Amino acid sequence: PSGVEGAAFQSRLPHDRMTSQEAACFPDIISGPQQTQKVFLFIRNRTLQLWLDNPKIQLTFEATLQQLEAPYNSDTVLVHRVHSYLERHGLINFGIYKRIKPLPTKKTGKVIIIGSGVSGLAAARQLQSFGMDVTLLEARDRVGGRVATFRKGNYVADLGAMVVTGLGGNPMAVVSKQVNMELAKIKQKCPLYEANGQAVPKEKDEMVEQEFNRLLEATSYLSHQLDFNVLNNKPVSLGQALEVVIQLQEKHVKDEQIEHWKKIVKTQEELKELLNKMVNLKEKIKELHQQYKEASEVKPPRDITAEFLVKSKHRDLTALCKEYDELAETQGKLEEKLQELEANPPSDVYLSSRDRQILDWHFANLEFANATPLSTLSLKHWDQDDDFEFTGSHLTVRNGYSCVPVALAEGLDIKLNTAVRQVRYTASGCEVIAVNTRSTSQTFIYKCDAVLCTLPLGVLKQQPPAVQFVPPLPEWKTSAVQRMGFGNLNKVVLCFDRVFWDPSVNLFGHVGSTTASRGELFLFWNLYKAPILLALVAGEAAGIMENISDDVIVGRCLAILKGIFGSSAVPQPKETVVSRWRADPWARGSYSYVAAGSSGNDYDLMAQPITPGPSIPGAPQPIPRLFFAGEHTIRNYPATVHGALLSGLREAGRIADQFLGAMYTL
Amino acid sequence: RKPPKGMFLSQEDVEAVSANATAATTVLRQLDMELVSVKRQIQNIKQTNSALKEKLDGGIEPYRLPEVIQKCNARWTTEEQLLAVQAIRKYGRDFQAISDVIGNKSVVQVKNFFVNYRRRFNIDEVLQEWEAE
């Protein structure tokens, strides 16, 4: 899309309708006459386009109104309201921009942000952008959180997020322009090598993937068209449903062989009755011939009865011969028909063990995408964020994904090595109690007007709690935390002294031996300039490889590499790293998934902020004081770096609106 | 609105493979037995019918008989009249057989022959006797 309308698409907004957010801030216009709505919609799209076309510089209200044309640059309070709206919710002037007018020296309000992960940083920068006192508390000795990059020498490999899913309306595209990221496309071709070490033949490789893709659609049919969503009270999981579809395809393969062979018996046995006539008729003909011969033996001249007898027997024998010839006619059709049916038997098996093992790799990939075993994923909802897909090739970051957070952390008050241990929020303010991660006895107290919590969902789910909330989080929020899924997928970094793989191939698979080990080192990435290979560990195997030393793991990697490229070809790696995301106590997981029994609605429940009870009974309802952000709170774009960043922008606008006031709604 | 072509899914089918734990595995075992059942039933009629095939070895070539290519005449030699009556006694109204016996009389000639000689050869009487068998 292009024009002013490309700005609306690139900003995740319908170019020709007012959104519900926009209606909330501009009720007069949405409820007014169709002409006004179009004016507004243009002013919105046009401002977005301006910010987009150059995102390294602030878009001031002046700059904007300058470059509108009448009739649009006529009403200047409509322009001012629109520019303020966009700036507030991070649709313009977000990320890293030169400010034209430097920030006012005196700040209003005070906000503690827990975590300098990408979502934390994105709010922190916005809030400070809005003139607030913002301090981030980070347990780690580095920012970024789950956006980790490992650097040593010229080796550079990401242990966390490493892919940008398309620039088509992605906030990261604007960020990439703001902070140089070597963004290189990911070529889609992935060859699959089996346990022996031989590449799967292309004909088989295509045949399975279609079956795979064919199976996934069937579940979606079980879900939406047969409402197969509950079994014995427990809700059905994607894994369950895939089995009920593989079983029903193996059932069908059998029903198909039965009613085929059952056509052979129903014809073999027409033949049985036909041969019984034919052998009992060759017996009547044997006898009649004898009678006709004996009757013909009588020497003429004979009486007319003895002469009738010869003729009558001759006719009768001829009539029987007609019969027996018509029956070996019919015997010929059936003889061929049985050969036809035997010649075209139906498929022997639905899937071979080799075929099934290859399929099991396609399920590993799907347990990679969702960072969880397929049994856990909700059948109805696992793919509910599939409508909001960006458009474009997926990319990687050659310089490491760590630059984006570091870029964002510029100018922010970040207290590293500071584990928040208690959040305490009351009708009049909040205090956050943290310790120092190195000597934990040394205690810190932070007072503030509002606390924004970007704790990973896995941290939020820890029992007994890593962080205590005083007063305790209400049951609707905690229940949401139990229901939601937080999964895990780990990575292994392999640093060699020479490229010994196909350099024009970004990623190549390895097929497992079992279903149970389908995730164990199932996929490798060439993505960087240097000779670095990344091996994933997903599925049920991720949780289990965390109990196994790095040497045993790098061992299993070398062996797999040796099979695909030859024992002589792969040398020992110079530097090796393994990730343990579930073990890490600052994550306790990888990213969230829609677990069975959860829905997308839970992702909205996490985002809702918490409001404390009045200190004095009978006092007026207090302002909300605890706000949440992060990858587990944005329902439309969960488990992604862009989603985390969007969640941070969203809370900053809402927090600012609550404490600085929204003057753009009149 | 419809399943992927070639993928078989039936509500009926689905309940039956979910109704308990091992129900899917149980259902396939019968089909595995229903299959072996019908499969050796084949080798057993394939066996029965291979014996009957052997019994026909030679067909009926030795019992066959050559063709009387004989020009179909019009006059009724007293010989042929008598073959007629005896044919009517053994064959009732099957003129094709009656004509086949006599050898040189067409079916119509036989057909109208009954009316002409019917009084003369008591052929009602003969026919009822043919009805008695």
UniProtKB/Swiss-Prot annotation, chain A:
Source taxon at top rank: Eukaryota
Annotated SWIRM domain residues: 4-103
Residue numbers bearing the Phosphoserine modification: S441
Keywords: Acetylation, Chromatin regulator, Chromosome, Coiled coil, Cushing syndrome, Developmental protein, Disease variant, FAD, Flavoprotein, Isopeptide bond, Nucleus, Oxidoreductase, Phosphoprotein, Repressor, Transcription, Transcription regulation, Ubl conjugation
Disulfide bond annotation, renumbered to this chain: none
GO BP terms, alphabetized: cellular response to cAMP; cellular response to gamma radiation; cellular response to UV; cerebral cortex development; DNA repair-dependent chromatin remodeling; epigenetic regulation of gene expression; guanine metabolic process; muscle cell development
Expression induction or repression: Down-regulated during neural differentiation in neuroblastoma cancer.
Annotated positions binding FAD: S119, E138, R140, R146, M162, V163, E631, T640, V641
Tissue: Ubiquitously expressed.
Coiled-coil stretches: 258-344
Effect of K333R: Loss of polyubiquitination
Leading EC class: oxidoreductase
Catalytic activity: N(6),N(6)-dimethyl-L-lysyl(4)-[histone H3] + 2 A + 2 H2O = L-lysyl(4)-[histone H3] + 2 formaldehyde + 2 AH2
GO molecular function: chromatin binding; DNA-binding transcription factor binding; enzyme binding; FAD-dependent H3K4me/H3K4me3 demethylase activity; flavin adenine dinucleotide binding; histone demethylase activity; histone H3K4 demethylase activity; histone H3K9 demethylase activity
Cofactor names: FAD
Crosslink site: Glycyl lysine isopeptide (Lys-Gly) (interchain with G-Cter in ubiquitin): K333
Notes on activation and inhibition: The N-terminal sequences of INSM1 and SNAI1 compete with histone H3 for the same binding site and thereby inhibit histone demethylation (in vitro).
Processing and modification events after translation: Acetylated by KAT8 in epithelial but not in mesenchymal cells, thereby regulating the epithelial-to-mesenchymal transition. Acetylation by KAT8 reduces KDM1A association with nucleosomes, thereby decreasing histone H3 demethylation, leading to transcription activatio of target genes. Polyubiquitinated by JADE2; which leads to its proteasomal degradation. Deubiquitinated by USP38; preventing it from degradation by the 26S proteasome.
Glycyl lysine isopeptide (Lys-Gly) (interchain with G-Cter in SUMO2) cross-link, chain position(s): K272, K299
Record remark: domains: The SWIRM domain may act as an anchor site for a histone tail.
Disease: Cleft palate, psychomotor retardation, and distinctive facial features: A syndrome characterized by cleft palate, developmental delay, psychomotor retardation, and facial dysmorphic features including a prominent forehead, slightly arched eyebrows, elongated palpebral fissures, a wide nasal bridge, thin lips, and widely spaced teeth. Cleft palate is a congenital fissure of the soft and/or hard palate, due to faulty fusion.
Protein family (similarity comment): Belongs to the flavin monoamine oxidase family.
Protein name (Swiss-Prot/TrEMBL): Lysine-specific histone demethylase 1A
From Swiss-Prot, chain B:
Tissue expr: Ubiquitously expressed.
Record domain SANT: where: 71-122
Any coiled-coil regions, as ranges: 24-59
Post-translational modification, as annotated: Phosphorylated by HSV-1 protein kinases in case of infection.
Subcellular location: Nucleus
Assembly information from the UniProt record: Interacts directly with GFI1 and GFI1B in a RCOR/GFI/KDM1A/HDAC complex. Interacts with INMS1. Component of a BHC histone deacetylase complex that contains HDAC1, HDAC2, HMG20B/BRAF35, KDM1A, RCOR1/CoREST and PHF21A/BHC80. The BHC complex may also contain ZMYM2, ZNF217, ZMYM3, GSE1 and GTF2I. Interacts with REST. Interacts with the SMARCE1/BAF57, suggesting that the BHC complex may recruit the ATP-dependent chromatin-remodeling SWI-SNF complex. Interacts with SOX2.
Role played: Essential component of the BHC complex, a corepressor complex that represses transcription of neuron-specific genes in non-neuronal cells. The BHC complex is recruited at RE1/NRSE sites by REST and acts by deacetylating and demethylating specific sites on histones, thereby acting as a chromatin modifier. In the BHC complex, it serves as a molecular beacon for the recruitment of molecular machinery, including MeCP2 and SUV39H1, that imposes silencing across a chromosomal interval.
Entry comment, domain topic: The SANT domains may bridge the nucleosomal substrates and the demethylase KDM1A.
Designated name of the protein: REST corepressor 1
Organismal lineage: Eukaryota, Metazoa, Chordata, Craniata, Vertebrata
